[PDB]
Design a protein around this ligand. Sequence first.
Ligand SMILES: O=C1c2c(O)cc(O)cc2O[C@@H](c2ccc(O)c(O)c2)[C@@H]1O
Ligand SMILES: O=C1c2c(O)cc(O)cc2O[C@H](c2ccc(O)c(O)c2)[C@H]1O
Ligand SMILES: O=C(O)CCC(=O)C(=O)O
Ligand SMILES: [Fe+3]
Length: 346
Amino acid sequence: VAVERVESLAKSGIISIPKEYIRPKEELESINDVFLEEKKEDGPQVPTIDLKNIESDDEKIRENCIEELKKASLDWGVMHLINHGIPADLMERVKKAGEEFFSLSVEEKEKYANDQATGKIQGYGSKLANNASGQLEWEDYFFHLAYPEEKRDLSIWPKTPSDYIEATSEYAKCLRLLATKVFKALSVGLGLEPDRLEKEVGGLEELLLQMKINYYPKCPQPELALGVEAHTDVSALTFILHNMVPGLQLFYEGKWVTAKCVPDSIVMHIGDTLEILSNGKYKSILHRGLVNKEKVRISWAVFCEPPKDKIVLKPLPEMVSVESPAKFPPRTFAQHIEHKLFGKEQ
Ligand SMILES: O=C1c2c(O)cc(O)cc2O[C@@H](c2ccc(O)c(O)c2)[C@@H]1O
Ligand SMILES: O=C1c2c(O)cc(O)cc2O[C@H](c2ccc(O)c(O)c2)[C@H]1O
Ligand SMILES: O=C(O)CCC(=O)C(=O)O
Ligand SMILES: [Fe+3]
């Protein structure tokens, strides 16, 4: 087998992209210039949610915050979080370190190469074709478990820069605390006890935080390919950071909306796991990512997942009634992923 990285392809000189990266004719029609889309101020826009008072002593003020978070989650399922409590400089250090790692040569990064054939899913890689179509996406990435600390495999974490492990582990610790706050506000919104949702996804013991760094090289024909294909996140919650280069688009009310860059904010996605548990109340939105020919785009996504086999996911009893039948059958995290993959393959 040959090992092809998109970064190498982007530097091979080619002025035209391989056939494997061109989307189907029907899909190409919806792809435009990400820079112009970013400028449009008409139509629905991704909501910005302020979490300053999410845990305020003032009852009226606290409830107003919880209510705004609830509404955005029921409608969009995605949002720009501000006043989230995570130090701005810590985030700068995480991004700087990621940029230094991907700044190394491909040959150097290959020393961290993953190997799916033997179950080694953590490390440097690029998505391999997994079905008849043979479609490929314009991106490389690095994936690894970031929390709980005792479950980590530090041996595969970048050794360059020297502070990658230190900054990434502290950031992971901060996100874990923020997740607990979001889970409580969301529980209360559904009329459940404060600790209900986080408990159903594994609690402090079983809940996992996976880190995926997405690297999108410049593309010579940006309107024929996608950085990431259209999909919904299978996680409970997803927290993302980026390098102020536009690219994320959301499929809202039948149309692809382009997300704007909001300084010091953190994008949060409601994932399939919470959508299933709430029987469809909280939305797991369809989204994708565009590439361009002028700037390299990078993003840092942290997926909060429940144990893959230990828990059977299904609508909670309180969310199901004769008038509101279950919208999803019972399945584990692993079985859910397999079902989604089985869909496209078929
Ligand atoms: O490789 C993958 C993957 C993985 O290696 C480890 C893990 O813990 C979760 C994962 O999730 C998969 C997935 C599949 C379909 C989706 O719609 C989606 O959002 C995510 C993904 O393919
Ligand atoms: O969307 C994604 C995703 C998600 O939504 C939820 C989740 O819990 C894990 C995830 O991880 C995906 C992934 C991991 C390793 C890979 O090698 C890869 O190609 C893809 C990512 O794509
Ligand atoms: O790069 C982004 O904005 C997000 C990519 C994405 O959807 C994912 O990694 O699941
Ligand atoms: Fe996603």
